[PDB]
Design a protein around this ligand. Structure first.
Ligand SMILES: Nc1ncnc2c1ncn2[C@@H]1O[C@H](COP(=O)(O)OP(=O)(O)OP(=O)(O)O)[C@@H](O)[C@H]1O
Length: 289
């Protein structure tokens, strides 16, 4: 059971769930309404500003993919806009310290969505720019790369939806259609989509840095003596997009090695979607000097 979809079927599903999200009846001051607005801006950027300039079909555009929450939301919206526009080269820079659950997830979703995955060499000591230069050598026709970074992410401040790479990178246009999204919008859309998400989030992770530094978020630690946290995504979860027989998905449990690490904490956490404050998204970290 590999939950595999042909690319066209994956695109059509994504178009349907995104359209379905947009049809949710919500109050103007709600998280869902804000998310619908964010989706519209993202669609406009892709359909109106991106696709007419760079062809998503011939290899001009590659999709920067690392299996995280930003990546998956952008992938679902990108697939939606491909279907909308018409009716998948992907690049992951691998590291020696990536969570096994994330590695697994990247592989599983590459299968699920019929992606064409390129991975850099996790055993080569190199910068991201250097890894992308090698990637350019392999795919010299690449003009643009889709990146799901948000303004609230580190180094997210001075970015624009369409922006050339820095001087030390290979020469491409960065396509950054998710900049205006906030953490709450990411969770709301993801939970509603009923698509598989990296299961580390379910255990209290709000970011996925690396195996040595990242911990479940201390703000999400369960304690009899803390005010219990409220869930802002009850509707989305309870009314999540119902899939047909072709498109059915199931979560994939976390890697054995990661469950052992979580169990070793002897502490339980609310899932990551109990966090909606962007300022605390990377709070789950080992104390370093
Ligand atoms: N190692 C990588 N390989 C390919 N793309 C990457 C990589 N790291 C970041 N990116 C790109 O930058 C965007 C930001 O992802 P990042 O993982 O930095 O943010 P996030 O999803 O908010 O955090 P997390 O994954 O820790 O929960 C991603 O959507 C992806 O497009």
């Amino acid at each position: 059971g590999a939950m595999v979809m042909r690319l066209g079927d994956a695109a059509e599903l994504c178009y349907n769930l995104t359209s379905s999200y947009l049809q949710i009846a919500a109050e103007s001051d709600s998280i869902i309404a804000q998310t619908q607005r964010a989706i519209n801006t993202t669609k406009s950027i892709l359909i109106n500003e991106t696709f007419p300039k760079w062809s998503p079909l011939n290899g001009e555009i590659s999709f920067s993919y690392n299996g995280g929450k930003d990546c998956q939301v952008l992938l679902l919206l990108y697939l939606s806009c491909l279907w909308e526009y018409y009716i998948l080269p992907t690049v992951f820079i691998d590291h020696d310290d990536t969570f096994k659950t994330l590695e697994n997830f990247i592989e599983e979703t590459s299968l699920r969505y019929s992606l064409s995955l390129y991975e850099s060499d996790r055993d080569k000591c190199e910068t991201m720019a250097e890894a992308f230069e090698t990637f350019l050598q392999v795919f010299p026709e690449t003009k643009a790369i889709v990146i799901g970074i948000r303004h609230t992410d580190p180094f997210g401040e001075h970015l624009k939806p369409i922006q050339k790479t820095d001087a030390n990178w290979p020469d491409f246009y960065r396509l950054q259609p998710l900049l205006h999204w906030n953490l709450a919008n990411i969770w709301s859309f993801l939970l509603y989509s009923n698509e598989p998400i990296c299961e580390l989030y379910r255990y209290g992770f709000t970011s996925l840095g690396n195996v040595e530094e990242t911990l479940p978020n201390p703000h999400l630690r369960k304690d009899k003596n803390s005010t219990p946290l409220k869930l802002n995504f009850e509707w989305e979860i309870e009314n999540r997009y119902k899939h047909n027989e072709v498109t059915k998905a199931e979560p994939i449990p976390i890697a054995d090695e990661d469950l052992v690490k979580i169990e070793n904490l002897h502490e339980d956490y609310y899932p990551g979607w109990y966090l909606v404050d962007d300022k605390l998204e990377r709070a789950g970290r080992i104390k370093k000097k």
